[PDB]
């Protein structure tokens, strides 16, 4: 009944690449907001 079942070290690739993509649309954004302060 797939007993004892590791998830390995692919799915922990796919469990950081969720870390990165966010840290980077976490970084996007804060380069927008000076971008509209220099508009401003």
Same mark, same amino acid.
């Given at each position: /009944? /797939?007993? $004892?079942? $590791?998830?390995?070290?692919? #799915?922990?690739?796919?469990? %950081? $690449? #969720?870390?990165?993509?966010?840290? *980077?649309? *976490? %970084?996007? *954004?804060?380069? #927008?907001?000076?971008?509209? /302060?220099? %508009?401003?």
């Amino acid at each position: /009944k /797939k007993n $004892s079942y $590791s998830y390995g070290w692919s #799915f922990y690739f796919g469990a %950081l $690449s #969720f870390i990165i993509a966010e840290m *980077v649309g *976490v %970084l996007a *954004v804060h380069m #927008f907001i000076d971008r509209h /302060k220099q %508009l401003t």
